Structure to design on (620 residues):
RNA sequence: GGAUAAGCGCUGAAAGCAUCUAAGUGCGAAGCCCACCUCAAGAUGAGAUUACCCAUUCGUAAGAAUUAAGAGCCCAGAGA
RNA sequence: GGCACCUCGAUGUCGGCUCGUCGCAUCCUGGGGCUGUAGUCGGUCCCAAGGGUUGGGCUGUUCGCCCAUUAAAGCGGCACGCGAGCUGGGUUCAGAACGUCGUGAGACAGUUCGGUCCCUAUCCGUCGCGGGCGUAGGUAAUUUGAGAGGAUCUGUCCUUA
């Protein structure tokens, strides 16, 4: 779960620790492993929730 | 409930090719991330039996940014099974001759030591001063940094 | 550079000059049958895979008459190599009278096949004592130190023996008294009965 | 020559860490103090 | 220090290429070339040289002060070109000229020679008194070291090749 | 041969000197490695070269069965 | 020496024969320094384990001694190397004897004679020769060489003089 999601996060150049850190910074979602399950075909869910984390670190 | 996992790769694998080089790049910092790509660990599709073994290409492999006097005190070893089997390839030596196992033995130290690790680890693509060969397929140059 | 394509007929002794009884030997000195040069480009080495011994129809093969393909004519039996070359023709070349590596000849043979032997018989350790109420004689000795639960390799202990080619150095004959069909050599030239004795020279010289 | 505890012997001597070895430079062939 | 702060004049048109070790010096020997420091912090000035420092620790300033001495050795090395002291003291230790790889005669069952790759400019004044010429002090001193490398002097009487000072401390016996 | 250990070098730098060293350059051993000989592509990366057969019949999907080039059985004997 | 932690439903413990291997605190051969070394011969240490490191007499036994030697006559480790390889001179049966001790039964490593050492290789490991497959055709010859081994020693005399 976490390995493939830091694989796609690292494909966006993002590291798991600051991503998750942006997830605690982030919304009501602290949802973990379904958020790992978006490894299939989710630039919208994956990179957009990544942008939610970008406005959570921001 | 039960099968929320997904391999999505364990038959339908990918095959991609990467010229990866810097003429002088340090050995460890190149080595573990080219290890990561030869896993395909950076690819978002990991399976413990993924076989995302990347075509990890290196050319022009003359130099490590060699910190300290490592070309004088790196010295390697080996042991033939004949008793008293010390045979040592040493530090700066055979770098200038054949800097191949100067890399991929250390990437054997990188890899998961198993049949898949020896699969892609024994599917490296290694050139030391070259413009390599067989660009019939499509190669792509990967990064510079240690990321 | 040494077309020494040939066998011996045996081992003798003759006085040659100012008397000097010398253990003397010979090679049959059949005409050399050397193929093309086969330079470094197609194959990184230099040598010639020289053909020899002139078969009849039976002992051949379509890669043997088919070696008279990429040769020109006359399929042969034996093929060796010689690095150090002159080169004349693709298939068959010039005979015994030229010598171009040295007269301390470092002669190469394929030793007499004496078979499986005793432990001493060529491994040369001490045979055990006979007398004085001890069972131990004709058995080579212990080999494993106790600190490992192993035995080492490397120590010669037995072995079916004899078909082992040897390249002995500096066999001593001068510029050979030739013939159409002789080569004088000296004494215990290695090999066996009906064994080809081809030889390059001066590798320690 | 060899003594690991190098202390000065002749006046106007020199103490070197040549190649990481503390050798001794004097004008006399008698004492030429090897570090060890 | 008190070297790199000071200046080295470059008279007679030394013709330096400022690129790298490409620094070439000009004299009666002509246009020769030795080295640079590494490639950097070498401000080759004009009519003199004022090589700057990037920092003043013993790696930083001190090792281009090294090359103030080295390009100094190019300047005054090419200015004439010279040699060291060399005299073959011995009761039969004679030396003569055989072309340019010339004869030095200890008395061994081999015969001794001198070879220089680019600069002998040479004279045997006599089998006692010899001198060579080179341009680099390094080439000179390693060359005269090669002269030392076939017969050394003694602690007992005059042998080997002379350098004007050795403080011989000649031992005795009997 | 080359890299050298130890040791001995030139120039040199804090330290204007000095200084075999810090860069930079040498010399230097039965050590090491290559070179001398042998085993050696099951060296799975399984090499590279030389030649030959070629590209068959059966729905052949699957295969099956010929058969080339051969290779072998079988026999004789030993240089083994 | 000490230690009692495995070994009492078995860890056979001397010495030797055979067969070795490594270590270096290097015995010789290699280089180099210093010398209270004129050399010759020496002392001395630094780097060095490539190779080699004698044969007999006596001592069951180590150590040690003698002879004659060479390049030298190294030191150790390895179940004081190795008994499913071996011997059995040594305690380590029972005998018998002495000396000495104990009334005695016996004892005291104090001596000495004699004294009872099996294994038909299953695995791993060794040595040598094979089959089955592979090396995107079946073959048949050729070799390169990734790698692995072997081997390395040493006088003597003359010249230089």
């Amino acid at each position: 779960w976490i390995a493939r999601i830091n694989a796609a996060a690292r494909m966006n150049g993002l590291s798991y620790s600051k991503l998750m850190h942006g997830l605690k910074l982030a919304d009501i979602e602290v949802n973990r492993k379904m958020l790992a399950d978006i490894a299939i075909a989710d630039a919208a869910a994956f990179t957009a929730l990544a942008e939610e984390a970008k406005k959570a670190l921001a | 409930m039960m099968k929320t996992t997904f391999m999505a790769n364990a038959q339908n694998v990918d095959r991609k090719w990467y010229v990866v080089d810097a003429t002088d790049v340090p050995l460890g910092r190149l080595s573990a991330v080219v290890a990561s790509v030869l896993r395909g660990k950076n690819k978002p599709t990991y399976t413990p039996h993924a076989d995302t073994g990347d075509f990890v290409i290196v050319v022009n492999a003359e130099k490590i940014k060699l910190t300290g006097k490592k070309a004088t005190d790196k010295v390697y070893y080996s042991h033939s099974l004949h008793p008293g089997g010390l045979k040592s390839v040493t530090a700066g030596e055979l770098r200038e001759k054949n800097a191949v196992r100067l890399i991929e033995k250390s990437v054997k130290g990188m890899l998961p030591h198993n049949t898949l690790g020896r699969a892609q680890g024994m599917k490296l693509k290694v050139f030391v001063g070259a413009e390599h060969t067989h660009t019939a397929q499509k190669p792509e140059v990967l990064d510079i940094t240690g990321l | 550079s040494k077309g020494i394509l040939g066998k011996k007929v045996g081992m003798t002794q003759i006085f040659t000059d100012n008397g000097e009884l010398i253990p003397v030997t010979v090679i049959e000195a059949t005409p050399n049958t050397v193929l093309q040069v086969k330079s470094v480009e197609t194959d990184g080495y230099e040598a010639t895979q020289v053909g020899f011994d002139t078969l009849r129809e039976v002992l051949t093969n379509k890669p043997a008459k088919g070696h008279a393909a990429k040769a020109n004519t006359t399929p042969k039996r034996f093929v060796r190599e010689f690095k150090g070359l002159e080169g004349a023709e693709v298939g068959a070349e010039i005979t015994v009278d030229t010598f171009a590596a040295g007269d301390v000849v470092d002669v190469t043979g394929t030793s007499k096949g004496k078979g499986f032997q005793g432990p001493i018989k060529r491994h040369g350790q001490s045979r055990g004592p006979m007398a004085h109420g001890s069972r131990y004689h004709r058995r080579p000795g212990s080999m494993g130190p106790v600190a490992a639960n192993k035995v080492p390799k490397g120590k010669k202990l037995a072995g079916r023996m004899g078909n082992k080619r040897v390249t002995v150095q500096n066999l001593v004959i001068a510029q050979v008294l030739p013939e159409k069909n002789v080569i004088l050599v000296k004494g215990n030239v290695p090999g066996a009965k009906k064994s080809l004795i081809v030889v390059k020279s001066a590798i320690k010289a | 020559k060899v003594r690991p505890s190098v202390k000065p012997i002749c006046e106007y001597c020199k103490v070197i860490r040549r190649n990481g070895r503390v050798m001794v430079i004097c004008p006399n062939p008698k004492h030429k103090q090897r570090q060890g | 220090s008190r070297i790199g702060n000071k200046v080295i004049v470059i008279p007679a048109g030394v013709s330096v290429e400022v690129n790298g070790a490409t620094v070439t010096v000009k004299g009666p020997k002509g246009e020769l070339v030795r080295s640079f420091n590494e490639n950097i912090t070498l401000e080759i000035a004009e009519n003199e040289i004022t090589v700057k420092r990037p920092n003043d620790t013993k790696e930083m300033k001190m090792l281009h002060g090294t090359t103030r001495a080295l390009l100094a050795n190019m300047v005054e090395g090419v200015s004439n070109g010279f040699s060291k002291a060399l005299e073959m003291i011995g009761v039969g230790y004679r030396a003569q000229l055989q072309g340019t790889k010339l004869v030095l005669s200890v008395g061994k069952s081999h015969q001794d020679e001198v070879e220089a790759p680019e600069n002998i400019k040479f004279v045997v004044a006599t089998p006692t008194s010899i001198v060579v010429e080179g341009i680099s002090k390094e080439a000179v001193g390693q060359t005269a070291a090669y002269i030392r490398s076939r017969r050394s002097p003694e602690p007992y009487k005059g042998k080997g090749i002379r350098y004007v000072g050795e403080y011989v401390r000649r031992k005795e016996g009997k």
